């Protein structure tokens, strides 16, 4: 089943050839090129109609290698109607070459359609949300001021961040000119600041509502929440627009002022002063924040068992019932999912300041995407309550 | 979870009673055990409430005479009312609002037990 390449026959057995073909470039020398040699023919006989395995012995036929830039072998060239399409020059076990040529012969159509239900989630769970807010006199309540100041944030991360987002990946290429990729910069930023910040408001919100309710009561009015809100908006705009409209973002790096000078170029290119406060302002104040409130909460029902079985004179010891590792399992959804979600993203942020070419640009990416899901995930974790569950039904027809 | 209210009745102007309520079920350790009351055609309003941190907070019409305690290692709360007026004639209900949740409060609500003063 596996073609032996020359270098006469090589533009008629793979560059005019049916369909995908893959090429490697082995030596009888070179001892990871005998390593994979059996590895091809499993894939050869397990790949068949949907590939052609082809090999070229450089020995042999040196003519060839050169063409094509070929510094190291093992290189397995995956052609596509006489184009290179895929490119690796290190050894792989089969289980690792099964999911690059998976990958690259399916023609990225997963990658596109995983946007389209990220849209679809964050669009109708949010919609949802604030609709069952707005119509139910029920649930007009002050943490439900945080949850809608929230759910707005995740919505224009659905309706316009997103959809601009998925564009530029599908295209690789901006469309819609220098201007609006400032301005989309702007939205993403605000949305996702103003997203984590009201997280960080709600973690508050809750801590007080639970430890002292009637401190509560006084202390957090409708106007202070409203001030609170209008805060988190005023800083997530100070933080997004006036940075990144006026150029204060900007790095004076020649590479960089490319970017900045081609409308095509929608890259996110920062300075470092920029990328850092940013980045704290955005995430980790809040997080802390959040680590902070939540550790108290956990602290604070803890102390309470120590009341009770303090106050037994030694009769009962307290374990942990049903209501306690359900608030536990609560607490780990919270801080899991929006550090799952966010903190690789604003990790790796942080990371290209130090050393610029540690992490990949599809790693930046993709974990910038991991972020945008939390977005879908916030209607899911903070609109739980009977309150909530009794109007999303009635609002389902 | 059940809420068993008990120490109401016909007392004299003046008098005192002891309402009591055991909370009987799972129970997150960080709650509020209040006392709520519903006078003829009036809508229920808080008389007391105890925070599992020992905060309290009283109606003003019952301040100096309605004292709110809960018991040291049970989910028992105890409403000590002296002084008793005719005005303070209604059902009583024990309520319950478990935080276990984290970002909502549940609550429970006793059958309600009824108080009568007569003048």
């Known amino acids: 089943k596996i073609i032996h390449l020359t270098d006469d026959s090589f533009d008629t057995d793979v560059l005019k050839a049916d369909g995908a073909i893959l090429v490697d470039f082995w030596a009888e020398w070179s001892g990871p090129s005998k390593m994979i040699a059996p590895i091809l023919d499993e894939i050869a006989d397990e790949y068949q109609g949907k590939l052609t395995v082809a090999k070229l012995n450089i020995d042999q036929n040196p003519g060839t290698a050169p063409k094509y830039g070929i510094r190291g072998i093992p290189t397995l060239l995956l052609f596509k109607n006489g184009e290179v399409a895929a490119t690796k020059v290190g050894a792989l076990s089969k289980g690792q070459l099964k999911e690059f040529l998976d990958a690259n012969l399916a023609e990225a159509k997963v990658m596109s359609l995983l946007m389209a239900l990220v849209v679809l989630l964050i669009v109708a769970g949010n919609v949802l949300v604030i609709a069952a807010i707005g119509s139910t006199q029920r649930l007009q309540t002050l943490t439900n001021l945080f949850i809608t100041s929230l759910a707005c944030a995740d919505l224009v991360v659905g309706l316009l961040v997103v959809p601009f987002g998925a564009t530029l990946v599908v295209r690789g290429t901006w469309l819609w000119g220098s201007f609006l990729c400032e301005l989309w910069t702007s939205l993403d930023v605000l949305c996702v600041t103003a997203s984590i910040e009201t997280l960080c408001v709600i973690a508050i919100d809750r801590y007080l509502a639970i430890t002292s309710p009637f401190r509560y009561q006084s202390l957090m009015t409708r106007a202070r929440a409203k001030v609170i809100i209008c805060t988190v908006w005023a800083i997530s705009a100070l933080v997004s627009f006036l940075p990144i409209m006026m150029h204060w973002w900007r790095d004076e790096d020649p590479q960089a002022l490319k970017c900045y000078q081609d409308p095509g170029c929608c890259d996110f290119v920062t300075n470092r002063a920029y990328a850092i406060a940013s980045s704290i302002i955005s995430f980790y104040i809040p997080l802390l924040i959040m680590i902070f409130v939540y550790l108290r909460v956990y602290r604070e029902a803890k102390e309470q068992i120590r009341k009770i079985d303090r106050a037994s004179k030694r009769k009962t010891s307290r374990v942990m019932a049903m209501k306690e590792h359900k608030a536990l399992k609560t607490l780990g959804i919270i801080m899991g999912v929006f550090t799952l979600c966010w903190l690789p993203f604003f990790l790796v942020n942080i990371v290209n300041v130090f050393n610029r070419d540690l992490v990949p640009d599809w790693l930046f990416v993709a974990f910038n995407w991991l972020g945008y899901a939390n977005s879908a995930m916030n209607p899911i974790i903070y609109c739980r309550s009977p309150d909530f569950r009794k109007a999303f039904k009635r609002l389902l027809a | 979870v059940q809420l068993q209210e008990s120490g109401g009745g016909l007392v004299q102007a003046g008098g005192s009673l002891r309402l009591s309520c055991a909370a009987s079920?799972?129970?997150?350790?960080?709650?509020?055990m209040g006392w709520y009351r519903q006078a003829p055609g009036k809508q229920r309003e808080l008389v007391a409430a105890i925070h599992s941190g020992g905060s309290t907070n009283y109606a003003n019409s019952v301040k100096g005479r309605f004292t709110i305690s809960r018991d040291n290692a049970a989910n028992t709360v105890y409403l000590q009312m002296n002084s008793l007026k005719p005005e303070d004639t209604a059902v009583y209900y024990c309520n319950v609002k478990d935080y276990g949740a984290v970002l909502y409060e549940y609550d429970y609500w006793g059958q309600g037990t009824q108080v009568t003063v007569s003048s």
């Open positions: 079920g799972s129970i997150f350790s960080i709650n509020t």
